[PDB]
Enzyme design. Structure first.
Site, PDB file in Angstrom:
ATOM      1  N   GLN A  70       0.828  -1.199   0.000  1.00  0.00           N
ATOM      2  CA  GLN A  70       0.000   0.000   0.000  1.00  0.00           C
ATOM      3  C   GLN A  70       0.868   1.257   0.000  1.00  0.00           C
ATOM      4  OE1 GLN A  70      -2.398  -0.693   3.575  1.00  0.00           O
ATOM      5  NE2 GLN A  70      -2.872  -2.737   2.820  1.00  0.00           N
ATOM      6  N   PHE A  71       1.902   1.259   0.843  1.00  0.00           N
ATOM      7  CA  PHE A  71       2.667   2.461   1.154  1.00  0.00           C
ATOM      8  C   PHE A  71       3.982   2.575   0.369  1.00  0.00           C
ATOM      9  CE2 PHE A  71       0.064   1.419   5.013  1.00  0.00           C
ATOM     10  CZ  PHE A  71      -0.699   2.577   5.072  1.00  0.00           C
ATOM     11  N   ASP A 121       0.551  -6.774  11.982  1.00  0.00           N
ATOM     12  CA  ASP A 121       0.181  -7.108  10.627  1.00  0.00           C
ATOM     13  C   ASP A 121       0.765  -8.464  10.295  1.00  0.00           C
ATOM     14  OD1 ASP A 121      -1.246  -6.678   8.103  1.00  0.00           O
ATOM     15  OD2 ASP A 121       0.411  -5.521   7.264  1.00  0.00           O
TER      16      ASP A 121
END
Ligand SMILES: *[C@@H](CC(=O)Nc1ccc(C(=O)N[C@@]2(C)CCC[C@@H](Nc3ncc(Cl)c(-c4c[nH]c5ccccc45)n3)C2)nc1)CN(C)C
EC number: 2.7.11.22
Lengths: 65, 281, 298
Positions: C13-14, C123
């Protein structure tokens, strides 16, 4: 071939930190605020705060550069 | 945790004489730059003058942090003040202006201590115009990678405040001699602030600092806590350790004694000098 | 800088991650370049920097370097040859009990160290368990990791990729301990056993459905304060399939491990230390020596 458990031996350089489950009998937990039900329900006890605070106090206390 | 941290490892030093050697070379390194960029002229600050400037702007860094809204963790402030101290160990106030860097230090510390505040609410705490407030943001964002680079990416700062709560837990539990160790708080907290104005944070461990603060408070309160260090910390057993601890806690009391604040007159003239470096170079 | 991008490895995502070789040294490295615009350097590149400079353990990924320009930063890691999710979803690989022992051992040792230093990974999932070409498993993606043990500190839910998310985090608990990593360890174990996601919901409430279908809906006996969590909505008393019906190939040693990991009470859920001292790990057979763990030749 068997694995055998052996704890992490990490030199903290200060006094002995009392065990997490010992804290209630050793009487430390009278000197932190109680975790409320929502915190307890999430797995967050007052013993965790107390344990970390005590470890922070004793870490590096007898170290010198 | 402190005992295997980057703080311990790279950012805690063996004496003030080590610090002065870093700061001396930080000023010297600059002079070769400004001599090549420009001459041994009187424009340049002396390392003690930079120490006055860093001492002045560190008190401005605490002002900005005390008047900051939303509010601010002492954790964030202590981390900011620590980055400020650590920035100015290997860098000269005449290359990176401390007014900017103190806000780059508060900004990086707000993020690293996971304290939520955005770029508009951040510069909304600067007493400037929205032109000045948004000019500040450009310089804060230009310097933020440079701050992190000069910290060697050691962004975790072990502050005396958690140690201090640890000793308070312990003293209430297993030194019932001190019938209320809570009363030591304000004085120890006051002493911590003073220890923070000195180089103590680059010299002693967080726990040693917190312990010195508490005992300085107890001694000031007319209480002796020998049986706490000997018995409870089990140095009635290990002897060489009890002396070494007392030698550490007494070397720290000397710092809070042999500290003198920035003199306003000196600060005025030194700001003048600094700004003549920063109009140039 | 002193690296040459050789291959694109993926997107987070990042960030977007690439194989590089550092010209100085025979480390092949995964550079994780962050993607962007006036907030400064990304709080997720910082979160990984701040937490990984402090930890050091063979079962945690080693941050080698960081570098950048303006607000744009690279993080540099040892390149890991593979990950646990690739191993799980490789139909030609056979995960013997020793193999499942050897991965679950390394996860728990990495995670023992991590919890000792007061950090939750938050996570954990098989793609965040990288495995090197010498067969050491390392936890990776520290970008959502947070320190715990602070009373006056609200944390968020929406940590963990839904399928590996603990029911206290699905009930949106503000404060939580190491149980959030231990549940995810259960979900990863179950997935090494079954070779498919154990609980693949597709809403946060379809996740609580698939948890409670499979493991039974928690009573108050099994979770005294469940009720006081903010999002606590009551369920049908789903029976729970007995764990030997789910994992029929398991022995009572492994079923004790699995059971301890899936306890609804996040306080009673076995810690990483408790878990390592269970008879499963000391019992025969011994964990496969990392050298012999199965390497997917594509
Ligand atoms: C034949 C053909 C073949 O299938 N070859 C392959 C396939 C896949 C890979 C590979 O590079 N796999 C990955 C991308 C799997 C995940 C871990 C990757 N390594 C890595 N190392 C360090 C870090 Cl920090 C990261 C990392 C962290 N987050 C992410 C997100 C996305 C991507 C990467 C990430 N990754 C390795 N190699 C070969 C094969 N012959 C016969 C050998």
């Amino acid at each position: 071939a068997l694995y055998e458990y052996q704890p992490l031996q990490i030199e903290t350089y200060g006094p002995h930190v009392p065990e997490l489950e010992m804290l209630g009998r050793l009487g430390y937990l009278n000197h932190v605020r109680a975790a409320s039900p929502q915190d307890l329900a999430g797995g967050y006890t007052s013993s965790l705060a107390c344990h970390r605070a005590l470890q922070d106090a004793f870490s590096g206390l007898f170290w010198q550069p | 945790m402190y005992h295997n941290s980057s703080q311990k490892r790279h950012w805690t030093f063996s004496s003030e004489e080590q610090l002065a050697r870093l700061r001396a070379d930080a000023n010297r390194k600059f002079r070769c730059k400004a001599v090549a960029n420009g001459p041994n002229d009187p424009v340049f600050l002396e390392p003690h003058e930079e120490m006055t400037l860093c001492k002045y702007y560190e008190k401005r860094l605490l002002e900005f942090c005390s008047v900051f809204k939303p509010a601010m963790p002492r954790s964030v402030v202590g981390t900011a003040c620590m980055y400020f101290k650590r920035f100015y160990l290997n860098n000269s106030v005449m290359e990176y202006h401390p007014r900017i860097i103190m806000l780059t230090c508060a900004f990086l510390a707000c993020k690293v201590d996971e304290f939520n505040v955005s770029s508009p609410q951040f510069v909304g705490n600067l007493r400037e115009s929205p032109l000045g407030q948004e000019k500040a943001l450009e310089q804060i964002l230009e310097y933020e990678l440079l701050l992190i680079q000069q910290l060697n990416f050691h962004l975790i700062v072990h502050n005396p405040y958690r140690p201090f709560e640890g000793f308070l837990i312990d003293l209430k539990t297993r030194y019932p001699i001190l019938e209320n160790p809570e009363i030591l708080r304000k004085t120890a907290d006051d002493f911590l602030n003073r220890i923070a104005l000195t180089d103590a944070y680059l010299l002693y461990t967080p726990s040693q600092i917190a312990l010195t603060a508490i005992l300085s408070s107890a001694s000031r309160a007319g209480i002796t806590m020998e049986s706490y260090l000997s018995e409870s910390l089990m140095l009635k057993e290990n002897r060489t350790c009890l002396s070494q601890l007392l030698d550490i806690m007494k070397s720290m009391r000397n710092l809070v004694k042999k500290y003198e604040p920035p003199r306003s007159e000196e600060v005025a003239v030194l700001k003048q000098k600094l700004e003549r470096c920063h109009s140039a170079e | 800088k002193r690296y040459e991008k050789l291959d694109f490895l993926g997107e987070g995502q990042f960030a977007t991650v690439y194989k590089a070789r550092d010209k100085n040294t025979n480390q092949i490295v995964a550079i994780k370049k962050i993607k962007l615009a006036k907030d400064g350097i990304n709080r997720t590149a910082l979160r990984e920097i701040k937490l990984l400079q402090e930890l050091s353990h063979p079962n945690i990924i080693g941050l080698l370097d960081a570098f950048g320009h303006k607000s744009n930063i690279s993080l540099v890691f040892d390149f890991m040859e593979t990950d646990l999710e690739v191993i799980i979803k490789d139909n030609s690989l056979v995960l013997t009990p020793s193999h499942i022992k050897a991965y679950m051992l390394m996860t728990l040792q990495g995670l023992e160290y991590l919890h000792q230093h007061w950090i939750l990974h938050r996570d954990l999932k098989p793609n965040n368990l990288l495995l090197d070409e010498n067969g050491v498993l390392k936890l990776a993606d520290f970008g959502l990791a947070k320190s715990f043990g602070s009373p006056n500190r609200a944390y968020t839910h929406q940590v963990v990729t839904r399928w590996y998310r603990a029911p206290e985090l699905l009930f949106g608990a503000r404060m939580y301990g190491v149980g959030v990593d231990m549940w995810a360890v259960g979900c990863i174990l179950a997935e090494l056993l079954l070779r498919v996601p154990f609980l693949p919901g597709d809403s946060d409430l379809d996740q609580l459905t698939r948890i409670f279908e499979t493991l039974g809906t928690p009573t108050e006996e099994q979770w005294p304060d469940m009720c006081s969590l903010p999002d606590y909505v009551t369920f049908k008393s789903f029976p729970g399939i007995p764990l030997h019906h789910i994992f029929s190939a398991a022995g009572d040693d492994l079923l004790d491990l699995i059971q301890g990991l899936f306890l609804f009470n996040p306080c009673a859920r076995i810690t990483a230390t408790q878990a390592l001292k269970m008879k499963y790990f000391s019992n025969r057979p011994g964990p496969t020596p990392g050298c012999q763990l199965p390497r997917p030749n594509c």
